[PDB]
Each structure stands twice: as C-alpha cells, then as structure tokens.
Amino acid sequence: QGTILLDLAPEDKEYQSVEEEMQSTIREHRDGGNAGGIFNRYNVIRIQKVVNKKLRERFCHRQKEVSEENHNHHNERMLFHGSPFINAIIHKGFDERHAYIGGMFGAGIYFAENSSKSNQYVYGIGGGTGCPTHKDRSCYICHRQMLFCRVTLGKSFLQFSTMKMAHAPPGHHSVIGRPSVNGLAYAEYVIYRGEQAYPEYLITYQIMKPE
Ligand SMILES: CC1(C)OC(=O)N([C@H]2CC[C@H](c3cnc(N)c(-c4ncccn4)c3)CC2)[C@H]1c1ccccc1
Ligand SMILES: [Zn+2]
C-alpha cells in the first residue's frame, strides 16, 4: 500500500548505473561552492528503488494523456531533484500544491540533469542555512538525499526565465529554462503537475571534502 524502499547492491549494474550518472554530472558552479558545498565527489552510501503501486499507476495514466496530446511521444526523461521534502515525496508523490511563484522560480517542481545542481537545493533555496545540526551548507558529516526521477516532459516550451509561470503554456506539458547571458547557466526542467514525475531512485550520500 504505502511505499516500499528496495536496497540495490553495489554489485548490481543498476546501482552502478545510477551512481555513475550522479558522480559524473558534478559540475562547477559560479557561487564558489556557497550553496551546495565545496566538493569534487560524493560518497554514495545508499541507493534505494522506490516502489509504490498507486504512484506508478497515476504516473502511467498521466503519461498516456500527455502522449495523446504530444503525438504519441510522452518524452520521458531521467532527471535529478533535490529538496528538503524528499521523504514526503517518496511516500505521497510529487505535489505541485507545494510549488509557489516566488524569487527566481515559478509555481512548478524543478529538476536537473546535473546532480550537483540538485545538491544546491537539498537544504533549501541557495542551500538555505545548511544542514540542521551544524547549519553548514558544506557539511561533510550529515547525510543528504536526492532523487533520480522518471520525468514526463511531453511537449516542452522553451524559454529563458521561468519565474512567473503558474502552469505549462497551452498545448504544452512542461517548461525548460535555457541558458542565457545574465541568465541561467544550466537548463532547468519544470513540470506543474506532480504526477509527471516518479521518484524512481532515492540516493543517500554525502559530499566529500577535496583531497
Ligand atoms: C525552487 C523550487 C521551485 O524547486 C523545486 O523543485 N521545488 C519543489 C521541491 C519540493 C516541493 C514539493 C513537491 N512535492 C511534495 N510532495 C512536497 C511536500 N512538502 C511538505 C509536505 C508534503 N509534501 C513538496 C515543491 C517545489 C521548489 C523548492 C522549494 C523549497 C526548497 C527547495 C526547492
Ligand atoms: Zn551537518
């Protein structure tokens, strides 16, 4: 009924596959490490498959709708997501009702192809005040969580800024904020319907200090 978390073993190719994507999508960010910490690698301590009959089924039902309106192409894609609400997400699914127009963001759920981008948000916008125990955005002690999700993008509307969007434009199912000068540095994939993202993998890790 609820969700069941399935431990993958490091010997399992799926485990290796998921970690590789994470480690390899670490990229340098213009903030000197202020948001997600200074690190050149992660210590992946755990990777669990998220199994939830209800959620999978809703996700599949939505994927079919988007498909009929996108010429039978649901445009599914694997993307990362980091936020202080992962534990809620893996049990109740993504819920746009917690997405609000504010600051540099529209009322949608944001994803990223780069694991280090998602890491910048695990403790809040701009990293917030860091981990709860040491209030350190660069804590190497506390364990972090991020999701490698299945994301139904359907027909994406491309634009430079995504901060005052309430829903995907007419005819579309997602919005991609693209790089610009004086703008974004990495593309941001946004959905406005929770059902368009299934949290396939729960990644437990720590950023490692440089050597
Ligand atoms: C900047 C935004 C646009 O990028 C996101 O992806 N955000 C999501 C993160 C998670 C959130 C969310 C999505 N699904 C949920 N299910 C819950 C959630 N929270 C509390 C209780 C129950 N559920 C929260 C909505 C916006 C936002 C966000 C908000 C605050 C911190 C980090 C990230
Ligand atoms: Zn800490």
Curated annotation (Swiss-Prot):
Localization per record: Cytoplasm; Golgi apparatus membrane; Cytoplasm, Cytoskeleton, Microtubule organizing center, Centrosome; Nucleus, Nuclear pore complex
Disulfide bonds: none
Domain PARP catalytic: 9-211
Tissue expression summary: Ubiquitous; highest levels in testis.
Residues annotated as binding Zn(2+): 131, 134, 139, 142
Post-translational modification (record): Phosphorylated on serine residues by MAPK kinases upon insulin stimulation. Phosphorylated during mitosis. Ubiquitinated by RNF146 when auto-poly-ADP-ribosylated, leading to its degradation. Deubiquitinated by USP25; leading to stabilization.
Superkingdom of source: Eukaryota
Role, per record: Poly-ADP-ribosyltransferase involved in various processes such as Wnt signaling pathway, telomere length and vesicle trafficking. Acts as an activator of the Wnt signaling pathway by mediating poly-ADP-ribosylation (PARsylation) of AXIN1 and AXIN2, 2 key components of the beta-catenin destruction complex: poly-ADP-ribosylated target proteins are recognized by RNF146, which mediates their ubiquitination and subsequent degradation. Also mediates PARsylation of BLZF1 and CASC3, followed by recruitment of RNF146 and subsequent ubiquitination.
Similarity-based family: Belongs to the ARTD/PARP family.
Quaternary data: Oligomerizes and associates with TNKS2. Interacts with the cytoplasmic domain of LNPEP/Otase in SLC2A4/GLUT4-vesicles. Binds to the N-terminus of telomeric TERF1 via the ANK repeats. Found in a complex with POT1; TERF1 and TINF2. Interacts with AXIN1. Interacts with AXIN2. Interacts with BLZF1 and CASC3. Interacts with NUMA1.
Designated name of the protein: Poly [ADP-ribose] polymerase tankyrase-1
Lineage: Eukaryota, Metazoa, Chordata, Craniata, Vertebrata
Name of the coding gene: TNKS
Residues of the full protein shown: 1104 to 1314 of 1327
